[PDB]
């Protein structure tokens, strides 16, 4: 087939009163890219490289 | 030994004893005491870490709408003071 | 039987009734006569699933037509431990 | 501290949070909560004038949001004497 | 001990045989009594927990509503009075 | 009791969180925990007729919105004697 | 009795209520749960003709709306001796 | 440690992804890997409700976007034993 | 705990303020009163996941008008041991 | 009391000025001044609650003009002897 | 040993295959896993030096997705956890 | 001993500490320094081998530039040498 | 180590200087000075892969800015056991 958390989250208002939890609500180095010339294998992340801070570093 | 207090209203005594088994079952936390508040208020109230008690409070709301008058309030108390101790059997 | 039935009503007269209700229609043992306040009443019975949810489904038909009716009507399968100073 | 910061509230979820902010806020002595009957909460707390009215202001901004809410964001600087028997 | 009392009347005695197959095949409940009234009222009865009780007899009445000639009452009792058991045969 | 209520879902997730409704919602051991294959997981649970369905009743309620949901929540109310190798 | 009856469906819930409704249906024994693969769950059982023949047309009358139906159902009475490995 | 953090997605790309971002972003223990069939990958942590809580969160947010994403992220607040020997 | 929570601002009187909601607001030790320098305070706390977790959301949006104003607000849940040298 | 009021500014003359209204208008002692570094001064004072809010308002109202001007001037009623440290 | 972790999971094991030639072609890397997810996922874990892991995942994000169905999810992962290994063929 | 110095500064120490916990998690590393340049200027210093402080760093650019007021330096040395070992408190 | 790290470029300063940045970033052995004719010439050193990577972008970064340029910056991670017999 194949076409949300689920925690304590879903309760609506809930409100203890006293908890609100409201903190929540959320290359120079030296040439790493001057050098691009660099031929065939190289560092750093041209794509599909997941931990490199894209959506990793948050 | 959980300081986190979560305390919730109810008119009639149903909603707050399947409030208390909702605090029980969602999360390992301990109930330090239930009151009958007087015209109908009753009022069960429960200690825990505080994300625990976080989450048997979302589930008690949760579970006690529907049945019964349901909730009258419900909050969270995360670091309960001193002060407020003597209210709780001092 | 710790499975847990528990009737509201407004008025110790469907109170009492309906715990005999209770008693009549399934042979279970109860174990609270709560006065809430301001006229509420509670009634808690233990006894097995099938003999509690039997006991009070007759007790909520056979309740609501007498003093003020019912007010809650709701049965816990397999109430905590801890729950137990509770009541 | 003599002045007193004392206040209802319906339920007292909002009864803790007005404690509990008096507590945030200012210092008084929580000398007693009260059931006046019919779920009327009262809270009392004693300390020096200018802490209690902070500490009242707080909690009064702090609890009528949640249940029922505030019934009175209420202050007196002198209890006098025969006052305190019924304390 | 199953204490809830199941118990179904029919016409027929193959009627009855239908509701003691359903009995025997829904839950768990201990056929007691197969008695002939007279005049074809074959009378079938069971012990078992309330629930147990009250699904095998909606099955047995489901399975018996056509066979023949049919019940004519379908009955169960949550908590019967133990005055009552002499009369079953104890 | 020896009464069979079991509950199958598109995932392990809600497979998982079902079982806990059925062991927190009413006293029923488990006894089974199985991969169907390609996505579809089964939980096995036993008890009281009462108990079984009393299990049944938040697991439905639980697992609806859980991953890629309930696939089947029927129960049985008694399997044979010689259903227990083939579970 | 040497006589086949098998049959297929999504999920295991059918699956079982089925094999249930076989093992009350007739004088068969169930000699085989296999999970074929992609939810494909088959049931295998030994039996006579007659016997299997009725418990094959009680399964497949069981899970209409059990689960999420069938697959297929069938009788055989001989299977060829050899095809033992394949049972 | 009671409380149980737990994530499915489809395949081993983002299952893994969520597991270190588990191990990494929070100090909780990591208890199991498993593979439902089908290409469903499980991931079973455990650790403080809190703790579990800030994990389940960054792992939600870290591997949705990787592979063909996230599938089922849920966490249990109250852990029953009775599960526990099935996992 | 081994969660740590920290935050900057510019200037000394709303860091305080934020280390003060810190200890009121949810139950945690705070370890660290750093001089950044250029008007850079930052406050370290040390707690569980989810106190500190609630904590800092209060001493944040609390803090957020107080004074200059917050810089950070986003906490890590399971430090690694190696932060031990930030001690 | 056991009030602590603060005052920052840009340089440390008008912090000490505002400290010199605060010590001179209300019944308030002060426990500190501390160079935040890059021109950001704080003062801190202690006392009687009231004492402690007039205070603090007349050296904000004297001090706007005062060098630079002032950045922060907010008090806390009870700090928490966890800030004592801190002091 | 490098700890340095890089893992391709292909529909299809020829692309899979193909992102492990990538990989032992490329760098100094060692292929410690090819395994089956089910329903025709198919995935590779190598292991190595960080840049080396780097630039063969690199090599088969270049020569994997137009081979067949072709690549379906890859990615690298730096320094792995301790916790992780046992996930990893213990 | 994974010579390579890999080091970055930033505006306050929740970046800082932020991308010293990225590179910590996101590679097996192991941070040796944390300086207060002043008037914001806080720097982390973190030793290991040329790939795996490559991915370390790319790490804490990518978790740092979203919060307090951002990186700002993030090149590393791969073999530095003796001399400037005394310069990191030798 | 057998990674390989390449540069071309017209004239040796080009040459020498990037080698001697080559050399200078990490640890790498220089193996080939080869003088191709027609002006271009190239430098072949051996080390790890981290190394020769580093190393090259050391000395593409020195050696950009004399002459017409460098013409090539080219590494292997590991040749194949069949070139260096033609080293």
Same mark, same amino acid.
């Given at each position: !087939?194949? =076409? #949300? ?6 309760? +609506? +208002? /809930? ?9 929540? /609500? ?12 660099? &031929? ?14 894209? +959506?990793?570093? /948050? | 030994?959980? @300081? ?12 707050? @004893?399947? =409030?208390?088994?909702?605090?029980? /079952?969602? $999360?390992?936390? *301990?109930?330090?005491? *239930?009151?009958?508040?007087? &015209?109908? !208020?009753?009022?069960?109230?429960? *200690? ?6 976080? $989450?048997? #409070?979302?589930?008690? $709301?949760?579970?006690?709408?529907? #049945?019964?008058? &349901?909730?009258?309030?419900?909050? @969270?108390?995360? *670091?309960?003071?001193? %002060?407020? %101790? ?5």
């Amino acid at each position: !087939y194949s =076409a #949300v958390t689920g925690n304590r989250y879903e309760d +609506s +208002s /809930k409100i203890t009163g006293p908890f609100d939890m409201a903190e929540d /609500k959320v290359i120079t180095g030296e040439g790493q890219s001057a050098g691009n010339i660099t &031929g065939d294998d190289w560092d750093r992340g041209d794509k599909v490289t997941g931990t490199e801070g894209v +959506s990793a570093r /948050k | 030994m959980g @300081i986190a207090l979560g305390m919730i209203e109810t008119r009639g005594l149903v909603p707050a @004893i399947e =409030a208390a088994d909702a605090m029980t /079952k969602a $999360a390992e936390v *301990r109930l330090i005491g *239930r009151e009958f508040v007087g &015209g109908g !208020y009753v009022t069960v109230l429960v *200690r825990g870490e505080t994300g625990a008690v976080n $989450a048997a #409070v979302r589930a008690g $709301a949760d579970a006690c709408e529907r #049945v019964g008058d &349901g909730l009258v309030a419900a909050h @969270i108390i995360a *670091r309960p003071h001193r %002060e407020v %101790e003597p209210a709780l059997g001092n």
